[PDB]
């Protein structure tokens, strides 16, 4: 499929904890997406797997709502336990098995050693759907935030903090990951997290509005 | 406060007045289910250490006193908490991990330690908060012909991350020649049996280990111990208990816009400013009740035993545990006169005090 | 960096240079006198109404008593510095209602009764330009109890046991002392600083000042209007410089900023663990039994004691520096205002 | 040492105020030298006749 | 050859910063002050520099201290000879005796011994099993090495705080001496002093 490269544009910030803080500058050391980096633009008109390298920032600017679900694992041929996040119009189905399953080809709208069967509300829903996945201490954490875009050119300029969804303590040794499609095209951005130090800014309403990446330029190190 | 029986003329800072709490408040979530620790600690068969089971304990009330009745163990060895304080405070979720090891490897179930079980079978994180419960199992997990149902892995390419499991069994290779599924030269199966016998020594006996992993309060609480709730009162200095968070202060209504995943509000001094009530989803401001300094204004004991008390920095309509209001607090026991003398005892912003004649008494003036 | 402009004065063994005119220049010197008076109690800061922490803190002796004694000595010394600088006159002299002093304009330094605090125009600019940290000398516990908007730094300082005491002399009394010294200077000369105030016309007093610096007094009487106009222009230039440039008053702003920053650091130091498991004391009490929580409480008590002693030592050094500056300001008040000085650059 | 740095991070801002005190002393030394020696505004020089 | 003490100070995080004014700039300032004093007198310190012959300037100086100016004009060569002889005796005393400059030597020596003590204090154990972090980290497990490293951290932090407090007190003393030196620059060089023993 067609690849491209574009700037991150100070985007990919999430709430690091479930604590309300207002009108205070807070310093956090966590796996963040560094500022002004190159994320990779994939055009899915066509597919080897993508490496899960210490965290993945996922974005999609698609109005037609085609993109759906993910696969996580390390070798993906029934020789390992693999995470499978499958979404639909009603629920989500998250499961860990050996998983020689398939939903990528044209089988759509016109088990083994199972550990857990978490089903919940759906994840997904001129709009940008931002996602952050990470795997720390055996715990799989998913952050998400949907933000409308006015001029569909690239990743927007500004800040939009991401809110946590679920903190699954299952998912072991994630190395490679995969994304589905849907046909009756798909375009998504993929970025890689890094152990950086940030300096978050809260307003009087408790919302993150500005941030400073402490290892970008010496001016930001002076600010930090 | 001066360690003397005679005091001289001047103003002395003695102590601070504090409003004592009147009532007590305990706020716990309305959960009536009982946590199934009997299903964990009393099982017919336990899994091996390479395929250890994990059980999620949630949406129930946990009583930790029945654990001693369930299994005959010695030590309830906890790390981040104490075994005697488990019934007061509470957590989000509790996970129970159960496996069988050898008596030599019980010491390896600890945060920050290497070995054979701790590197290839079961690794604990460095920020482990929980208890490890282990007891002997010579009567149920030992046979005279040997045991081969309990397997452990001793060969792996890399060390295991904390709380990770490995099920897949491949032919391990420690050389350039590939095994290709053949257990020949330099090819070993990673799983080998313990081989438990009743005639072994005390350090080689089978041990049943149950590891309870608590995670601290970040989400709404789903498992909480046996403690009755109390009705919530406001605008009074009381003692509160919000999901194990004890303290003293005044609970008022707030206009803070908490996001729906946030259950706490912290301050610059790392103290809880606001709390969310677990029964009714409302936000309460926590502020300490009234305090301030107390200064005693006296002449010498050679002159008189009369004193005047200055309550520093307060608007004294809330005095207790002649009245004149100054900028340094307010003065009780000295009469303000409309005269001007030289300063004798300095009090505050242009206010002094003296022991005068116009019957002797303590006066205050500019 | 350039040290200055190159110059070469034409020296010769029979040549001299003599001035034929003069200028009257008015300069401004700013000297700090006092600083903020603070009071810290150990029980609210280290423990925060925990009985177990207080019972363990009683085993550390009398560290808090001597910290309290040092802070009380600093607080007394600040009022002593202000009294020793400003209260130098024995009587409150007032200017007569006829405001003629030989053509010299003193309207921008003499007070006016229109405003309630009887301060001059230049005193109003000097009070407006130096912003304040708005510390606890104004009572704010009714405001701290009522949670409005966001939490202030002053409320977080007060709730942790840090309190700012008001000065003994208010700004109105300082302005009254300044006005008394100014009236005694412009109506008596140097006689009010050496006994009784003897009246003298201002032109003849300025002729005495001209005789002090080695100029014959006929130079003043032949050039009185020019000297009065130069003085008025210099006072207006001082007014315009104070109205425009705001970087001249950096010393008093630094005095305010250091005392705000020390208390902010002392508040922020309560979020540290100091090798314990939690900075919150109640979590240590609830999560553990007696002995282990006693160990963690001892670690927190030790760390908070070192932070408090560091604050007290820094305050003592700053108070010594402020006292030296106040002694210099009192000497300059005694020698420049109350007399005429022959010391060069003083 | 990374473990020592991680354990030193829990001690707060003692090193920040030590650094601030040393920086204040360093600025004060140059202020002292400027106050003592830089009293003249022009650099006068000796004429060649001695 | 051998390892210097300055290298051992620099390897442990101690750094000495250069001053803003070099010695050539201080010499330029001193030469400017000397030329302004000799050519102009005290006129250059209160405005524009006005030239005056040096014999007439010395007559002004004698008239300041209560001696009539004919005493200089009748004894000019004797006073010039006495001044030249006194400068020669100062040159001979500075070439011979080296105990006069003990204050600046003490200023150098205190700053040397403080940094030497701060380096030598790193060998202390403070109740731990070793003074080396690598030996503690390799010899023990996580918890015991955390305890020993915490003890070493507390001891080294206490020593560094003691050094900073002593430096602050010494800096206050140095600032008082510099204020006195600035006053003596303003009153002895730029003018004439009436104060006894000043
Ligand atoms: C001394 O200097 C003053 C200014 O400081 C001179 O006064 C000015 O003289 C000019 C020439 O007539 C006028 O245009 C100005 O208006 C004057 N300025 C004033 C009065 O402020 C004065 O002339 C000088 N004296 C000598 C002898 O040169
Ligand atoms: C991101 O990577 C691509 C791959 O070659 C590169 O062309 C692009 O310049 C990179 N972006 C940067 C360095 O900002
Ligand atoms: C906080 O929310 C209120 C409510 O709409 C809004 O009026 C105000 O502008 C917000 N403050 C910000 C965004 O800084
Ligand atoms: C707990 O109480 C809240 C409010 O009183 C109520 O909405 C909720 O249904 C209750 N839960 C149970 C399990 O009774
Ligand atoms: C464990 O469960 C079995 C089956 O219910 C029961 O017979 C046995 O008594 C239980 N053991 C204990 C110690 O309660
Ligand atoms: C606070 O003090 C002021 C000044 O005395 C007074 O006017 C005001 O009523 C007081 N506030 C109260 C009593 O609530
Ligand atoms: C005085 O100066 C002139 C020129 O500057 C010089 O020729 C003469 O020798 C000087 N007088 C003496 C006594 O040296
Ligand atoms: C100068 O004095 C007069 C009074 O004669 C006064 O009206 C005027 O305002 C004064 N000048 C200034 C700048 O205040």
From Swiss-Prot, chain D:
User: Could you tell me what this protein does?
Assistant: Precursor of the fusion protein processed in the biosynthesis of the S protein and the formation of virus particle. Mediates fusion of the virion and cellular membranes by functioning as a class I viral fusion protein. Contains two viral fusion peptides that are unmasked after cleavage. The S2/S2' cleavage occurs during virus entry at the cell membrane by host TMPRSS2 or during endocytosis by host CSTL.
Q: Which organism is it from?
A: Severe acute respiratory syndrome coronavirus 2 (2019-nCoV)
- Whichever gene encodes this chain, its name is S
Q: Which domain of life is it from?
A: Viruses
Name of this chain's protein = Spike protein S2
